[PDB]
Write a structure and sequence with these properties.
The structure is cut from a larger assembly and holds two copies of chain A and two copies of chain C (641 residues).
Chain A: E1 9-15, E2 26-27, H1 56-65, H2 77-84
Chain C: H1 5-16, H2 21-27, H3 41-56, E1 61-74, E2 80-84, E3 91-95, E4 101-102, E5 107-111, E6 113-115, H4 121-125, E7 135-139, H5 145-154, E8 159-163, E9 180-181, E10 215-217, H6 220-227, E11 230-233, E12 245-248, E13 253-258, E14 260-274, E15 279-289, H7 297-321, E16 327-334, H8 342-350, E17 359-364, E18 376-379, H9 384-390, H10 423-428, E19 433-437, H11 455-460, H12 465-483, H13 495-507, H14 510-515, H15 521-542, H16 550-560, H17 590-601, H18 609-630
Parallel strand pairs in C: 4-9, 6-7, 7-8, 8-10, 15-16, 15-17, 17-19
Antiparallel strand pairs in C: 1-14, 2-3, 2-13, 5-13, 11-12, 14-16, 18-19
Helix pairs in contact in C: 1-12, 2-7, 7-12, 13-15, 15-18, 17-18
Classes of the chains: A alpha+beta (87), C alpha/beta (641).
Bound molecules: a molecule of 2 linked components (NAG-NAG) (5 copies), 2-acetamido-2-deoxy-beta-D-glucopyranose (3 copies), calcium ion (2 copies) and fe (iii) ion.
A molecule of 2 linked components (NAG-NAG) binds next to strand 14 of chain D.
PDB class: cell invasion
Keywords: malaria, Plasmodium vivax, reticulocyte, invasion, cell invasion
Entry title: Cryo-EM structure of a Plasmodium vivax invasion complex essential for entry into human reticulocytes; two molecules of parasite ligand, subclass 1.
Chain lengths: 87, 436, 641, 641
């Protein structure tokens, strides 16, 4: 959003806890079916459900964790992610 | 990983910020957390996550200093940028890229550029106009390190910067390893006004170094905050010169720089710093707040400036806290509080490289270099304290103590903490919104 | 479907594995084309051949261009070098040279001869016998012929004889004769600054870079007979034979006759452009020489060969495989590059207004293959990072190792000499330029030479197809890497090290500058402002959007004009054409400021002080001026006040 | 909501009906500011006043700029003109002048005096008595002072005295004294070509446009006493009194002492920019002088007044009414314009690289109100069509009739003189420029004068608020009409008539050009190629889409550089700065080619022929070069082959 020529700016944030303890951050997690039988290393070629292209807990943290394990070429990003995942 | 919140965006210039915050605030108090059963702000029957999250429970105002690049932090912006471009860095620890030192307001830039050429290339200079902009410029990534006093090492310590090296102010054969206990903060009055007392300073003219500094601002106005119980200090003093204040106070009505450079906290103001506050005391002030060594440097005909050659070291005098009037030569009777030394701050990842480049760099250009004119000196400046303080002998190595609360010590951190509700710098507010 | 980088270098490699360069190099050495001087009939036959090839490859546009220049050719009478005795009754001839020196003055002289090893100005400084009123002899190397004749003209010699020795040039034949030109500076000399069309109607002018003394190239066996009459042994620091001697004996002295005529000929440059799909009017020029005095298989054969095969490759990728370049590509064939590169200089001086800030790279294919050992590159520093990436992706022809073997290759890059064809593109017009050679440690033994053929090239280099394949891969990867992306790969931060090296080299002399009352510190602050400008531009690339086109165009324009702003405005483009402050000739450049400053310490008094104050002022404000232009708008500039 | 043109001129008229110019003009004639030379204290007080106004109007950026120049001021000793008899015992003084001539040489001379009516070169041609070794007197008019002193220096006179007569300047007072400068060319003369900052460290240089003779302005009653001693009646073609005489009598001769010193002062230019919303870095500069020697209400009062009120109007329209300009606007306040416009010339020579192809119009507010009768405009022809539309929309202040009363006003437009402030923007930097005046048929009687006040201005012109309202409406309608639309309103087809007039003026001399062996026909074909270029560009505006931005930017760039391509590349910018071929000074311009050609027919032999061949070649290829640059790309250029 803040890139040119848009030049926007954040003005009102929001908190997620109770009103006693406002929490600005939130947690990014990876939820799977029970007993599927793979850890984070055995993630290759599995079907994945992302919450959107460019969003924080859906795209940037999950791709950024497994990012340097992809084979070259890395550019463009979603092509090599499209080869890493089987759908 | 952890992520910042969802945010309402807006334009940069047209805004409009106050109207969004007014609307969402008055919506928050009536409709947000189950105040009305009729309408819900955070839920809806046909769709969910509409217009807001469902897991949100209230709104917080973003301070006006914080832009997007400061809102996301440095690690997350580096993650999204290296993820989008696609570099996956290698990081060999042998070589190091040159350090982008930060300077300010054209009297630091000349000496900085001269230091960039006298060094082989390891030091490059990027500048700002006030020190609050240069701390943010270290946070975003355009700069690397700078030298600050403890009042700003506190603020940059809140923003997420660590101190690497400290400045020693006493000569020794072993100064690089020996830790220094810190310099003293004094107030200076004249012999002509012998009626002055620390008990009664009301309606008297005061001279400060700048807003936010240790000996100029924190140590005096903390004690005066215990006595007056007011946050405002333009009411207790009639007039005075404190650079960096708001333009509407009288504390800018006594300062001297012009035009539109009045109270600018940089070297464009004549009354800025220690020596400039001493010119405030000589010209128009009744009391000054400076370090304990200000009078021996400026008096005795050491400055070639015309205002300081006629000044004597004897006739000035520095008052204690009980009300006793005691001369300049023994500072150890009259000191308000111990202030810690100035430090060099930088980010966490550039800690080792700023350490190596500055120790390697201070061995060449340091304090052993005589014949200063006709050569280069890093610490010797033209009486304006450019990039460092002029009495800095060497930069002490800090091991086991690299944290603002470790380095600054408990008493000074508590002394600023008693002034926590009173400070009006927007950058401290912007670095304290991050904390939940 | 779209093609990214790592697909596209693969497609280029699949194209290069098919082609055959050797048959084309043998075709350009055929009996139909084998002598081609400038303006000869066979040169026009090769020109029509290249043009019909550029039509058969189906390029987007093919157009020729012709203009009439003046060169110098041999007369029907023969020039000779001939020993004259003091007795005068008996006169002994040495030899009748086949080769000649272009733009030498047609005259005949007699005199005593002095050996003058290379004609370097330091070499001329360390002579034993004074030089004046005499004929110097030099060995060909280390500098252009024109700088030899210019230096020996400055010490008031009478004539120049040029030969080739054993040690520098090891060959079998000693009767071999060769060709050169002696014009200091480039271009057609009888139109300096303006082009040689018929629109100018040919006014009487004359360039300043022409000598007044007769020059001649002789053979090695000719130099043996001269060395048989001379005396006094050569110094041992000179890498030379036992044969050479210093000065002529007291009895005998030499006589040189040179008879040449000024022939006015026709010149054909031939061009062909592939269009672009996004920004069609920005382009990158790829060119190569077409004529040579002898057969010229090594000089102009491999350049024209790599040119034609690169045209077939890029037209093949655009028409079939789907390569869509964002900006156009001009292929060029320059003629008469043997007489000091007049095809490029007349093209630039002709169409300067049309390519002002439009063209942005010259890539030289000339002399691409000489040896198989090393890789020697010479460029403007805006291309440096570009070249480094290419050196990490091109495999060497003999061994499988990559080309990036030295991580400090940037400190060994030499500047562009005046004989190179990319030097008028860099110095005069302000376009970045690159020239690369697979050069052996010693230079190629015969360039402007009758013996330069194909067969002798193929006994020098054992296998040639893989080597010229490697050179074509490098140049094609330059062209793809420039024109495939929305971001130009010019790296503008390399000027920071150049300015740092210069200001350091002035900081050695801060004491003398302090003695004149001048401060040096404003030039420190100028170098600082250039650093803050380049850093601000890099953060503007950081905060920009890569997919949007309008915000990237405004940032690519500043990168395209960072080279133009180093062209010094304060000198005349007709009097001193090469006016780039880093790489130019004249008094306004930066090494002329240092070389003018070095004379003060010796206290001779051959330097002027007002000229130094004026050079320091104009150089300071030139660097400061480029720094203010690069950093944003007018109101964002912060001077002191 | 959006604002189109016919709403926007209505909004401007609603703004102009409110304001009051008279109070501001009286404020700039207050006792606080009433003498302001360059670098005086009151000039800096007015500068800080204008800057605080530019902050109170809330402009987008306000910045000052200072640099140190050298001017010439009066010495403590007094200069005088004084009659010396041949007897020498008795010496009679005429007068002690209050005013002085800037950049005159400080000296004292004696000699015989000769009347020299205007110092025009034709006027100097038709003298009776030869001029040399003598002191000329001239009347102020028809040309700048520097051209008078330059011409009388070229005929080797000793000194110049300048006065004002009855007929040209009808005033009551005869004791009135005035001010002028005698620098041929503009700018600070002690830094020619480079700016006068401290970054250049002030090298020793000296411009060529400085005289060597003492100059002095005298009063009319001083000229009466000189005319009482002289003899021989003036010719009747001279519009003059009965009083003037030709030469001094045999006994008496005059003595002139002039004592001035070179004072080095500080200069403040003060700037304020309104940003744009589409293309923020292209802009249009509006400027006006700030100082004057006397009170200067007519010279620098109305310029600063119209400047401040236009700033309030445009900032008021941008902040409130919703005017969104597509490209930025710079307001400027130049000081020391009285010494030959040094504020603009140091601004241009300082920041040339930063505004190269960025700025595209200068609009001069200086001397906007002199009389109430006529409307006299002087501009570059790219603005001509623009001015014509404005003359059809501005109502005259006295009568209700429009300004467009003559449909052939384009043939009566005179070129920009050297004293005008827009001439360094047009000739030197290549930016189009416009200057307009409500000028009476006779000129204003007192400009550089002590009597120039407000009261005498308001007895010259009866009512002033409506007149200055009309001038502010014209300039504001220029600025709106440039920056409101996506299409620039520069009309580039007006150069076609200029080139047609030139080639016609050479076609009168086709016989002599035929005698030298030169053909003229390539210049015919050059003019033709310029017509085909402009017609092709007009059809490219025809086939373009008006709403799209990228296809209109590529077509606006060629319109912005059609002025820059007339700047002749072949001359040095330091030696001859005003290098525009149509409007410049030197040997390279087109009227110097015609004036060099006219000398051949007289057969004197004071002309050189090689210079004419060289000028015809370079002028031909300059016109051809702009024509090739304007018409598309490189490959679309069709030369013959
Ligand atoms: C400032 O430094 C001086 C000299 O460095 C200190 O003098 C010390 O004096 C004692 C006397 O017994 C010596 O044994 C030490 O070696 C000296 N040096 C140090 C580093 O202690 C002096 O005490 C210091 N004063 C302050 C206030 O720091
Ligand atoms: C263009 O210029 C050339 C060079 O001057 C002209 O060609 C010459 O014309 C003369 C006329 O008798 C011939 O004697 C020469 O041999 C020609 N030179 C060459 C190299 O062939 C030519 O006439 C000019 N005009 C045109 C239209 O081409
Ligand atoms: C001294 O410097 C000047 C230039 O810096 C040299 O020549 C002068 O140059 C100016 C400007 O072009 C012209 O007036 C003349 O060409 C020269 N002026 C003179 C001779 O008064 C000059 O060659 C330098 N060297 C010496 C020894 O004077
Ligand atoms: C810029 O140069 C000017 C010279 O024109 C300096 O101004 C003069 O400086 C001298 C010595 O410092 C003194 O006469 C006055 O301070 C100035 N004289 C006048 C007439 O203005 C100026 O100080 C220089 N500025 C900087 C920043 O170095
Ligand atoms: C003839 O024209 C030239 C102008 O081109 C005048 O002088 C020559 O100027 C050029 C300029 O580069 C110099 O290179 C020449 O050396 C000059 N000529 C001489 C003889 O020195 C010259 O004033 C003109 N008039 C005459 C009568 O020669
Ligand atoms: C003092 O500085 C000089 C400067 O080169 C250096 O050689 C020397 O080691 C330094 N001494 C100490 C004790 O740091
Ligand atoms: C040039 O050389 C000749 C003989 O070689 C000598 O007579 C003359 O003196 C030399 N010139 C000068 C200026 O000494
Ligand atoms: C110049 O005028 C003087 C008279 O003052 C005269 O003697 C002289 O001859 C004139 N010059 C020439 C060149 O005739
Ligand atoms: Ca030419
Ligand atoms: Ca200047
Ligand atoms: Fe401090």
């Amino acid at each position: 959003a803040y890139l040119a020529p848009n030049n926007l700016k954040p003005v009102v944030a929001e908190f997620y806890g109770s009103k006693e303890d406002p929490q600005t951050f939130y947690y990014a997690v990876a939820v799977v079916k029970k007993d599927s039988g793979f850890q984070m290393n055995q993630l290759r070629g599995k079907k994945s459900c992302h919450t959107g292209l460019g969003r924080s807990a859906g795209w940037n943290i999950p791709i950024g964790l497994l990012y340097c394990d992809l084979p070259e070429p890395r550019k463009p990003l979603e092509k090599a992610v499209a080869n890493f995942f089987s759908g | 990983a952890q992520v910042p919140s969802h945010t309402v965006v807006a334009r940069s210039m047209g805004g409009k910020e106050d109207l969004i915050w007014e609307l969402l605030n008055q919506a928050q108090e009536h409709f947000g957390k189950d105040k009305s059963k009729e309408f819900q702000l955070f839920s809806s029957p046909h769709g969910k996550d509409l217009l807001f999250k469902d897991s949100a429970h209230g709104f917080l105002k973003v301070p006006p200093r914080m832009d997007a690049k400061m809102y996301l932090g440095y690690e997350y912006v580096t993650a999204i940028r290296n993820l989008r471009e696609g570099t996956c860095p290698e990081a060999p620890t042998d070589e190091c890229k040159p350090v982008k030192w930060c300077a300010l307001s054209h009297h630091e830039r000349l000496k900085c550029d001269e230091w960039s050429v006298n060094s082989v290339g390891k030091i490059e200079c990027v500048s700002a106009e006030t020190t609050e902009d240069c701390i943010a410029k270290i946070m975003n990534g355009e700069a690397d390190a700078m030298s600050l006093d403890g009042g700003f090492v506190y603020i940059a310590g809140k923003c997420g910067l660590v101190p690497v090296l400290a400045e020693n102010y006493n000569k020794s054969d072993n100064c690089e390893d020996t830790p220094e206990a810190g310099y003293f903060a004094v107030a200076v009055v004249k012999k002509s006004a012998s009626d002055l007392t620390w008990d009664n300073l009301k309606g008297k003219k005061s001279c400060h170094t700048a807003v936010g500094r240790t000996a100029g601002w924190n140590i005096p106005m903390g004690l005066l905050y215990n006595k007056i119980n007011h946050c405002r200090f333009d009411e207790f003093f009639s007039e005075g010169c404190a650079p960096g204040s708001k333009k509407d106070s009288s504390l800018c009505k006594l300062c001297m720089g012009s035009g539109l450079n009045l109270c600018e906290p940089n070297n464009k103001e004549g009354y800025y710093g220690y020596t400039g506050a001493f010119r405030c005391l000589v010209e128009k002030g009744d009391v000054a707040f400076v370090k304990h060594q200000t009078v021996p440097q400026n008096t005795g005909g050491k400055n070639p400036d015309p205002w300081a050659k006629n000044l004597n070291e004897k006739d000035y005098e520095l008052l204690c806290l009980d009300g006793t009037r005691k001369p300049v030569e023994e500072y150890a009777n009259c000191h308000l509080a111990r202030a810690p030394n100035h430090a060099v701050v930088t980010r966490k990842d550039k800690e080792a490289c700023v350490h190596k480049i500055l120790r390697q760099q201070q061995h060449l250009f340091g304090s052993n270099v005589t014949d200063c004119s006709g050569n280069f000196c890093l610490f010797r400046s033209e009486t304006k304290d450019l990039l460092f303080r002029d009495d800095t002998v060497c930069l002490a190595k800090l091991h086991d103590r690299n944290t603002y609360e470790k380095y600054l010590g408990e008493e000074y951190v508590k002394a600023v903490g008693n002034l926590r509700k009173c400070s009006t710098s927007s950058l401290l507010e912007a670095c304290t919104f991050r904390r939940p | 479907f779209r093609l990214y980088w790592d697909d596209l270098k693969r497609k280029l490699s699949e194209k290069l594995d098919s082609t055959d360069f050797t048959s084309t190099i043998k075709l350009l050495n055929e009996n139909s084309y084998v002598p081609r001087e400038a303006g000869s009939q066979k040169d026009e036959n090769l020109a029509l051949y290249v043009e019909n090839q550029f039509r058969e490859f189906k390029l987007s546009k093919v157009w020729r261009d012709q203009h009439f220049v003046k060169i110098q050719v041999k007369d029907s009478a023969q020039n000779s070098v001939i020993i004259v005795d003091k007795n005068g009754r008996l006169v002994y001839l040495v030899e009748n040279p086949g080769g000649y020196v272009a733009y030498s003055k047609a005259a005949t002289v007699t005199g005593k001869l002095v050996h003058a090893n290379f004609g370097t100005k330091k070499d001329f400084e360390d002579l034993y016998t004074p030089v004046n009123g005499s004929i110097v002899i030099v060995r060909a190397g280390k500098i252009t012929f024109a700088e030899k004749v210019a230096n020996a003209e400055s010490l008031n010699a009478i004539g120049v004889l040029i030969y080739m020795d054993q040690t520098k040039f090891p060959i079998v034949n000693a009767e071999l004769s060769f060709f050169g030109h002696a014009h200091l500076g480039t271009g057609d000399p009888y139109t300096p600054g303006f082009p040689s069309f018929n629109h100018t109607q040919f006014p009487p002018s004359r360039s300043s870079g022409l000598p007044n003394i007769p020059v001649q190239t002789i053979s090695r066996a000719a130099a043996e007979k001269l060395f048989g009459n001379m005396e006094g042994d050569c110094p041992s620091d000179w890498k030379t034979d036992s044969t050479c001697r210093m000065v002529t004996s007291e009895s005998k002295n030499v006589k040189l006759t040179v008879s040449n005529v000024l022939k006015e000929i026709k010149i054909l440059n031939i061009f062909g452009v592939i269009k672009g799909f996004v920004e069609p009017d920005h382009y990158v020029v790829v060119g190569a020489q077409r004529d040579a005095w002898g057969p010229g298989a090594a000089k102009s054969g491999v350049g024209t060969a790599l040119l034609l095969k690169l045209a077939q490759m890029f037209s093949d990728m655009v028409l079939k495989d789907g390569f869509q370049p964002s900006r156009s590509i001009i292929f060029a064939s320059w003629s008469a590059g043997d007489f000091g590169s007049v095809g490029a200089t007349e093209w630039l001086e002709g169409y300067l207004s049309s390519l002002h800030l439009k063209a942005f790279t010259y890539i030289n294919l000339d002399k691409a293959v000489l040896g198989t050992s090393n890789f020697k590159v010479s460029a403007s520093p805006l291309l440096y990072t570009l070249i480094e990436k290419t050196m990490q992706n091109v495999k060497h022809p003999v061994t499988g190792q990559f080309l990036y073997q030295d991580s400090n290759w940037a400190s060994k890059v030499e500047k562009l000499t005046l004989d190179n064809a990319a030097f008028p593109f860099l110095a005069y017009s302000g376009i970045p330029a690159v020239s690369f050679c697979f050069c052996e440690d010693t230079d190629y033994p015969y360039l402007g030479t009758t013996m330069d053929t194909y067969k002798e090239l193929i006994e020098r280099i054992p296998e040639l197809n893989k080597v010229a394949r490697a050179a074509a891969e490098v140049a094609g990867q330059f062209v793809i890497k420039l024109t495939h992306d929305v971001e130009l790969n010019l790296d503008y931060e390399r000027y920071n090290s150049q300015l740092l090296s210069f200001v350091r080299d002035l900081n050695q002399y801060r004491a003398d500058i302090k003695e004149m009352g001048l401060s040096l510190q404003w030039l420190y602050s100028a170098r600082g402002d250039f650093f803050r400008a380049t850093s601000r531009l890099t953060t503007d690339f950081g905060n920009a959007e890569k997919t949007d086109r309008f915000v990237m165009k405004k940032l690519n324009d500043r990168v395209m004009r960072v080279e133009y702003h180093f062209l010094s405005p304060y000198v005349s483009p007709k009097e001193s054409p090469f006016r780039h402050v880093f790489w130019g000739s004249g008094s306004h450049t930066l090494p002329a400021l240092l070389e003018n400053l070095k004379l003060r310490k010796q206290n001779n008094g051959a330097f002027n002080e007002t000229l130094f104050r004026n050079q320091l002022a104009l150089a300071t404000w030139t660097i400061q001026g480029a720094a203010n232009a690069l950093s944003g708008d007018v109101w964002d500039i912060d001077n002191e006040f």
